[PDB]
């Protein structure tokens, strides 16, 4: 399939201005920008509750989404938003969570982890695991089924969900039933970049220069490129991880990175389904209701979550 027509219109106008000067771009500069994505439809749910989760040394905001017509004990998804470990928050991904809750038939906890460069690696990883542990230990208070709690996220948030599953394996818990990885950044050997990293490096919103900039903001040094908490695909033993669903986009530099993680999980004996959305780019979930292809794809991802936690 060719590019979704609405996405094509955005890209054609985006690519008219020259690429940013990444060697001098600051985070405070990048966040001061107007975001490429407009506010999209918020699907209705039974209840949305925002609150502060108190952890040692820091407080994390959480939004909990309870969908209509589900009865306790609820299945749940702990969700980590994308944004290159530098941007994004509860509101940027609020429409995504609502679709995941409503069509996934699950309570979604969207977690505001700490952002780089103010809080460099591994702050977000510690937040992602500690927030899952905080919620899972309170399953009874939240009326959750402890055997049906998943982790998930998009882009850098999919990275965090994949790494959280690794930390939970190492620490004997909490139990994770499923990982929902939406065009995740799960890493690769920098000496052998998967094809899409170079094939799709320019022209499709997420660019190679942008990826290197996020990484420079997030990491303490490039010696961390192969650290498995940054590149979970390089973790030596992926056996025993929760079953996974991976969504990739055809025109995403990360497309074959997601495929590489599916290969690695499959070779370690983990059940994994991967689906490539042939007409879409990185970040398509944030075009929900605006792009017909993005709408259809996010609803399908949500139904994969529903089936996994049924």
């Amino acid at each position: 399939m060719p590019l979704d027509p609405v996405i094509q219109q955005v890209l054609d106008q985006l690519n008219r201005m020259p690429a940013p000067d990444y060697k001098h771009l600051s985070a405070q500069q990048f966040r001061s920008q107007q975001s490429l994505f407009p506010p999209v439809k918020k699907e209705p749910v039974a209840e949305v509750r925002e609150f502060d989760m108190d952890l040692p040394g820091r407080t994390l905001k959480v939004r909990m989404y309870r969908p209509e017509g589900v009865e306790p004990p609820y299945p749940a998804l702990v969700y980590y938003h994308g944004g290159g470990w530098v941007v994004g928050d509860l509101e940027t991904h609020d429409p995504v969570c609502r679709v995941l809750a409503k069509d996934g038939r699950a309570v979604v906890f969207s977690v505001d982890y700490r952002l780089a460069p103010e809080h460099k690696f591994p702050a977000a990883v510690e937040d992602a695991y500690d927030a899952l542990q905080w919620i899972a230990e309170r399953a009874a208070d939240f009326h959750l089924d402890p055997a049906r709690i998943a982790v998930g996220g998009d882009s850098a948030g999919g990275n965090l969900a994949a790494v959280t599953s690794i930390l939970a394996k190492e620490r004997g818990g909490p139990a994770i039933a499923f990982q929902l990885l939406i065009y995740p950044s799960t890493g690769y050997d920098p000496a052998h970049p998967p094809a899409s990293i170079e094939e799709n490096a320019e022209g499709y919103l997420l660019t190679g220069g942008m990826m290197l900039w996020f990484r420079d903001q997030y990491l303490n040094s490039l010696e961390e490129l192969t650290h498995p908490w940054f590149s979970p695909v390089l973790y030596p033993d992926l056996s025993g991880l929760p079953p996974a669903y991976i969504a990739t986009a055809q025109y995403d530099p990360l497309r074959d990175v997601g495929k590489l993680y599916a290969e690695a999980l499959n070779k370690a004996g983990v059940k994994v389904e991967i689906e490539n959305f042939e007409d879409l780019i990185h970040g398509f979930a944030q075009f929900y209701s605006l792009s017909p292809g993005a709408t259809k794809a996010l609803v399908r991802i949500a139904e994969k979550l529903r089936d996994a936690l049924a």
Binding site: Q13, R16, L36, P38
Partner: protein, 51 residues
């Protein structure tokens, strides 16, 4: 007639309540909440000659 639901001031694209519009379609910027007049361009619809 419609009103600009959202428009990126720096990159010059947006949507009008929905139909796409870029900066070349204007007759330089639109701002959220403005009421405009345009032609349709249904060659994912797009706006043309926006006032």
């Amino acid at each position: 007639r419609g009103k600009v639901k959202w428009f990126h001031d720096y990159y010059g694209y947006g949507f009008i309540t929905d139909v796409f519009v870029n900066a070349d379609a204007i007759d330089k910027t639109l701002k959220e909440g403005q009421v405009v007049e345009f032609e349709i361009d249904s060659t994912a619809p797009q706006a043309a000659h926006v006032k």
